[PDB]
């Protein structure tokens, strides 16, 4: 947002962030993740500045929209909490999802079945998706990450300071990124709320699946 | 103890240039250091710098442009005649198309080419390229 009023954060987005807990970080702080922090409260928890989070999310969306072919963007999740969100983002946007394990040599070994040449890479966690991050440095691949208070920033170009521990926060971040990308593309509009709700991106937690199965 | 101030200033500038920093703080200041930085800035290697004036020896904050490969000092300050300058140019400079040797002459502190134009020798202070 270049100080444009249309791109400013609204009250409903703030309420969603507060409910999902995206403003809550860890007890440890990385020395390169300190410009996105606001203040350390009692009990050692670091609080994230949501305005800078919105700015970084908009910058990441601008980077994503700039790619002509939507399939050249690869979205990768290793933890189970982000797999459904990544799949939904790929379905709604048109990117290529990699959920679960990332096979080493995917970007370098050109004789493998899963060899790919993405133009952009988006990851859910630098510390958990470190293998896809490392192979980006071999093939000139820019990277976008959803970082936390304690997260290394090597090979990370656009870092979005969110909470990547909770399932609600990860799902909300992916949903908002997809919404911003679609609105910038000129597919959905900024005048009305998006039809899909952010609960579709949350981790199922098969305990919840069993609880809902026996509801009726 | 500290016995050369220009050496420390140039070493600090070189180390900060290697790390990709945008600004360098060098203390203490000195008018020899100011002349050396002015010579470097006239050729476009550093950029503008500001002298912070405390009541004791001052400090300098120097902006960096990323154009500096190596800046160094020569110790001791050897006397250089106008006919021995080409040997120092061959020994210290990387090419004959760029690079400068800094001398203190009776006319002032200048580079080797300006000392050839003014037809004077002096003592070598350092070099940069």
């Amino acid at each position: 947002s270049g100080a444009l009023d249309v791109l400013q954060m609204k009250e409903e987005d703030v309420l969603k962030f507060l409910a999902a807990g995206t403003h809550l970080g860890g007890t440890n702080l990385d020395f390169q993740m300190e410009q996105y922090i606001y203040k350390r409260k009692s009990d050692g928890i670091y609080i994230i500045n949501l305005k800078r989070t919105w700015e970084k999310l908009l910058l990441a969306a601008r980077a994503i929209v700039a790619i002509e072919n939507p399939a050249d963007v690869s979205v990768i999740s290793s933890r189970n909490t982000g797999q459904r969100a990544v799949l939904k983002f790929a379905a709604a946007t048109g990117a290529t999802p990699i959920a679960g394990r990332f096979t080493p040599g995917t970007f370098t070994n050109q004789i493998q079945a899963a060899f790919r040449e993405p133009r952009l890479l988006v990851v859910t966690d630098p510390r958990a998706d470190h293998q896809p991050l490392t192979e980006a440095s071999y093939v000139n691949l820019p990277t976008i990450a959803l970082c936390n208070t304690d997260s290394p920033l090597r090979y990370v170009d656009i870092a979005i300071p969110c909470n990547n521990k909770g399932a609600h926060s990860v799902g909300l971040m992916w949903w908002m990124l997809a919404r911003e990308v679609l609105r910038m593309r000129g597919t959905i509009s900024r005048e009305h709320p998006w039809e899909v709700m952010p609960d579709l991106y949350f981790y199922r937690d098969p305990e919840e699946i069993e609880k809902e199965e026996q509801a009726a | 103890v500290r016995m050369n101030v220009l050496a420390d200033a140039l070493k600090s500038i070189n180390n900060a240039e290697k790390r990709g920093k945008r600004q360098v703080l060098i203390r203490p200041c000195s008018k020899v250091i100011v002349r050396f930085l002015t010579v470097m800035m006239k050729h476009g290697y550093i950029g503008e710098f500001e002298i912070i004036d405390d009541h004791r020896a001052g400090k300098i904050v120097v902006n960096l442009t990323g154009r500096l490969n190596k800046c160094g000092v020569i110790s001791p300050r050897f006397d250089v005649q106008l006919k021995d300058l080409e040997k120092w140019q061959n020994n210290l400079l990387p090419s004959r198309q760029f690079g400068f040797i800094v001398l203190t002459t009776s006319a002032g502190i200048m580079d080797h080419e300006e000392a050839r134009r003014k037809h004077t020798g002096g003592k070598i202070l350092g070099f940069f390229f």
Partner: protein, 82 residues
């Protein structure tokens, strides 16, 4: 890291550094006006005093020196200068 304005440190940055490592040196000490309840005279006392300060009028111990700062006697009030 790789981008920091050395010319313009924040006010909280310069109060966290060592007094000599600041851009311009500045002491952490101050002078204060102290008054004992018994006697009305106002005495100027250095914060990091090294001697016992006695009230001239009434011979009252205003402060006792310690390792870092001088501690004022109970019931004595003080105000910083300037």
């Amino acid at each position: 890291p790789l981008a920091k304005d050395l010319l313009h440190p924040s006010p909280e940055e310069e109060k966290r550094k060592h007094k000599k490592k600041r851009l311009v040196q500045s002491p952490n000490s101050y002078f204060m006006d102290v008054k004992c309840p018994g006697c009305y005279k106002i005495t100027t006392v250095f914060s990091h005093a090294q001697t016992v300060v006695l009230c001239v009028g009434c011979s009252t111990v205003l402060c006792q020196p310690t390792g870092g700062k001088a501690r004022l006697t109970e019931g004595c009030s003080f105000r910083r200068k300037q």
